[PDB]
């Protein structure tokens, strides 16, 4: 039923892109159904984080959602043209205003736990922004990048997703499946 939840409650472009990423990783969205939901949720937050934000050129470049080949193509181009340090792992966005990459985490555990996992892996100039399903966020140097309204929008979406999962008795399983 999580499969059904995902196809019923995410935009179909998001679900198609989540399927695509799983196939590239070698994982079956028909089996790893909680991960499927997590990938959809994370992609949606990436798209929400970028949407409506301009400098009209887009303020953010979206890296998540692209396959690895295209994602490195875009990262390489940005590093070449801006001189910013090249990350050793693919991040989620680039912020043309602050000239830094951003790694987005969406977590169903303590926000600090997920923050430390990302940071332990990043080893540095990539900015980290973690959101939870409880309304909490944590970001590097307490710098949340976006305005308060745009963050509230993401938080509301996460609030809504949690509430609907719980109505279908999908939340408890989903929540306990997260591991780093
Ligand atoms: C890099 C990677 C991410 N994912 C998932 C974990 C997260 O739910 C989602 C977003 O990843 P991220 O926070 O590392 O950008 O994609 C995989 O399933 N396999 C992978 O190799
Ligand atoms: Mn990513
Ligand atoms: Mn991420």
Looking at the CA of residue 46, tell me the nearest atom of ligand 1: 15
- For ligand 1, mutation pick of 42, 102, 132 (most atoms within 8 Å of CB): 42
What's the rounded Cα separation, in Å, for the pair 7 and 9? 6
User: Is there a catalytic annotation at residue 57?
Assistant: no
What DSSP assignment string belongs to 131-144? EETTS-EEEGGG--
Strands 93-95, 100-107: pairing kind = antiparallel
Could you tell me where the DSSP H helices lie in the chain? 2-9, 12-25, 33-50, 68-82, 111-122, 148-167, 171-176
Q: Which helix (H) or strand (E) holds 51?
A: none
CATH class of 1-180: alpha beta
What's the rounded Cα separation, in Å, for the pair 44 and 158? 10
Instruction: Identify whether the C-beta of residue 127 lies closer than 8 Å to the C-beta of residue 145.
Output: yes
* Distance in Å, CA 39 to ligand 1 centroid: 7
Looking at the CA of residue 104, tell me the nearest atom of ligand 1: 13
Q: How was this structure determined?
A: X-ray
- 53 marked ligand binding residue: no
Instruction: Identify whether the C-beta of residue 100 lies closer than 8 Å to the C-beta of residue 126.
Output: yes
- 42 marked ligand binding residue: yes
Instruction: Identify whether the C-beta of residue 62 lies closer than 8 Å to the C-beta of residue 46.
Output: yes
Q: How far is CA 140 from the centre of its chain?
A: 16
Question: Resolution in angstroms for this experimental structure?
Answer: 1.9
What's the rounded Cα separation, in Å, for the pair 75 and 63? 8
Give the number of residues written for the chain: 180
Q: Could you give phi then psi for residue 100, rounded to 5 degrees?
A: -155, 150
DSSP 83: -
Using DSSP, state whether 177 is helix, strand or coil: coil
Instruction: Identify whether the C-beta of residue 135 lies closer than 8 Å to the C-beta of residue 160.
Output: no
């Amino acid at each position: 039923a999580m499969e059904d939840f995902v196809r019923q409650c995410f935009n179909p472009m998001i679900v198609e892109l989540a399927e695509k990423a799983m196939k590239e990783y070698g994982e079956d969205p028909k089996i790893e159904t909680n991960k499927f939901a997590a990938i959809c949720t994370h992609l949606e937050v990436c798209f929400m984080y970028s949407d409506f934000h301009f400098i009209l050129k887009h303020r953010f470049e979206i890296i998540e959602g692209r396959d690895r080949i295209m994602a490195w193509t875009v990262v390489n181009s940005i590093c070449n043209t801006t001189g910013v340090e090249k990350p050793k792992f693919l991040p989620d966005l680039y912020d043309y205003k602050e000239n830094r990459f951003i790694e987005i985490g969406v977590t169903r555990r303590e926000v600090h736990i997920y923050y430390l996992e990302k940071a332990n892996k990043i080893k540095e100039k990539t900015h980290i922004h973690i959101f939870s399903f409880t309304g909490e966020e944590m970001a590097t140097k307490a710098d949340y990048t976006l305005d308060e309204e745009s963050r509230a929008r993401i938080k509301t979406r996460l609030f809504t997703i949690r509430q609907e999962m719980a109505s279908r008795s999908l939340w408890d399983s989903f929540r306990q499946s997260e591991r780093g």
